[PDB]
Amino acid sequence: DVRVDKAVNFIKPEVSGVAEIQTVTGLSPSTSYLLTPAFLEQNFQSEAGIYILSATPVEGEGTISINMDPTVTTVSGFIKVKTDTFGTFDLSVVLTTASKKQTTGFNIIAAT
Amino acid sequence: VRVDKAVNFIKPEVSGVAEIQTVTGLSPSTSYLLTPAFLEQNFQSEAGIYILSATPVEGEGTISINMDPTVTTVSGFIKVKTDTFGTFDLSVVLTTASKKQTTGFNIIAA
């Protein structure tokens, strides 16, 4: 079986094009998870520029892309990542234009 | 835990009238999770808003995709189990059927 363990929002990086580390905690130690993108009720045109997020695991596989360009829109990808012995993992998250302060996120999917 | 397959949603014919999508080629009698995805779509190639909802015929959850620029949502997940023939059915509805963009879902298993 498979299930959604919990939903987490992506961080909002401070600087355009410069990745920040997002740490996720509270999961089972030494366990494989799959992350998929999602967002709810966002106005991506509240100010100028385009919301474009990319996220990868520091150690793992996959890239999540959320590109809200109005004639070429993408929500795709996944991340495969394993927790450490403390139930945590790190992602690298980059916003192409950091003034886009909309909220997006991912589901954390687990075997059961 | 991985994506086994990605499949496109059907494009229903009539606004607000659900149609059945059958997914095949999966493991028999196995639980899957579905989450939405799409690539390089122009949701403004014509007038009206792309708004899709999908639910399993047997299972739970709803995927919602509302590309309204004022209130954009790409969300929800479906839990569904295949029959003994590796298939399952979804019920898919477009609010405005003239929006013929392509969207879809991941099929996830462990």
Residue numbers in the entry:
A (entry chain B): 7 to 118
B (entry chain A): 8 to 117
Q: Which of the paper's sentences describe this entry?
A:
A major factor that limits the expansion of shrimp cultures is, however, infectious diseases from viruses, such as P. vannamei nodavirus (PvNV) and M. rosenbergii nodavirus (MrNV), which have inflicted heavy economic losses. While the shell domains (S-domains) of PvNV and MrNV contain conserved sequences of 62% identity, the protrusion domains (P-domains) and N-arms show low sequence identities of only 17% and 43%, respectively. In this work, we have determined the cryo-EM structures of T = 3 and T = 1 PvNV-LPs at atomic resolution, the crystal structures of the P-domains of PvNV and MrNV (PvNVPd and MrNVPd), and the crystal structure of the S-domain of PvNV (ΔN-ARM-PvNVSd) in the T = 1 subviral particle (SVP).
The PvNVPd forms dimers in two crystal forms with the asymmetric unit containing one dimer (space group P21) and two dimers (P212121). All structures of the PvNVPd were refined to resolutions 1.17–1.22 Å. First, the crystal packing of PvNVPd (P212121) reflects the intermolecular organization of the two P-domain dimers with a bending angle of ~110°, suggesting that the existence of this putative conformation in the T = 3 PvNV virions arises from the simultaneous rotation of A/B dimer and the translation of C/C dimer. In the interface of this parallel model, the three turns β1/β2, β6/β7, and β7/β8 from one PvNVPd monomer are in close proximity to those of one symmetry molecule in the absence of metal ions.
